[PDB]
Design a protein around this ligand. Structure first.
Ligand SMILES: NC(=O)c1ccc[n+]([C@@H]2O[C@H](COP(=O)([O-])OP(=O)(O)OC[C@H]3O[C@@H](n4cnc5c(N)ncnc54)[C@H](OP(=O)(O)O)[C@@H]3O)[C@@H](O)[C@H]2O)c1
Ligand SMILES: Nc1nc(=O)c2nc(CNc3ccc(C(=O)N[C@@H](CCC(=O)O)C(=O)O)cc3)cnc2[nH]1
Ligand SMILES: [Mn+2]
Ligand SMILES: [Mn+2]
Ligand SMILES: [Mn+2]
Ligand SMILES: [Mn+2]
Length: 159
């Protein structure tokens, strides 16, 4: 099973200038809990944005060019990325925009954080057809002293 996990600001913005400009510790904790001990697939731009391997996960990087770091697994196509994960129950695709576009048709589950923040950005999460997805979990949180915007965690499953 393939799942996508992402955090979206208003208008589905996910990034600006290869960065995420907000800081929401509760969302990073949600990301860690839902990805730990699973393989994570990311594109090369997101690998450069993160800047180091994510511990406790098999890190698979999609790039057309040879890898430059043997602490992670480099693959050259979607099918190779999937095969490199092996026979696991759940593969997590962690972006960025172009990678989400390629895996969305193959995904059964979306883990989305909706952040109430207006962000100039240059990368968006793909348009997804709402009729194809059922919301199976949602949890709203107001802003607090650690998290400066309100946010909504949602899990959607393909119908
Ligand atoms: N808010 C969130 O949840 C979230 C999550 C992830 C990322 N982001 C943000 O998203 C932005 C990066 O997204 P992006 O769309 O620019 O880049 P991306 O999807 O991270 O990376 C695209 C790169 O991945 C490689 N790639 C993708 N598909 C491939 C394929 N089928 N075969 C081979 N290589 C493939 C290519 O690398 P080569 O050029 O090396 O071939 C391509 O240029 C940043 O702003 C980051 O902060 C946000
Ligand atoms: N919901 C969500 N939030 C994100 O921030 C996010 N980020 C990415 C890509 N970027 C990043 C950037 C940093 C870290 C990171 O530092 N993660 C640590 C934090 C653990 C914690 O804060 O408790 C990790 O071990 O996962 C992960 C992904 C992909 N999907 C996401 N999905
Ligand atoms: Mn092929
Ligand atoms: Mn197999
Ligand atoms: Mn949203
Ligand atoms: Mn806000």
């Amino acid at each position: 099973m393939i799942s996508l996990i992402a955090a979206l600001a208003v208008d589905r913005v996910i990034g600006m200038e290869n960065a995420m400009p907000w800081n929401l510790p509760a969302d990073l904790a949600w990301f860690k809990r839902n990805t730990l001990n699973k393989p994570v697939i990311m594109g090369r731009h997101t690998w450069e944005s993160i800047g180091r391997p994510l511990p406790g996960r098999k890190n698979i990087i999609l790039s057309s060019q040879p890898g430059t770091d043997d602490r992670v697994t480099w693959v050259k196509s979607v099918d190779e990325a999937i095969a490199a994960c092996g026979d696991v129950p759940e593969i997590m695709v962690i972006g960025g925009g172009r990678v989400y576009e390629q895996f969305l048709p193959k995904a059964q589950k979306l883990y989305l954080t909706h952040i109430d923040a207006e962000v100039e950005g240059d990368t968006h999460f793909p348009d997804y057809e709402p009729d194809d997805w059922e919301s199976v979990f949602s949890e709203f949180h107001d802003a607090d002293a650690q998290n400066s915007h309100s946010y909504c965690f949602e899990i959607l499953e393909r119908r």
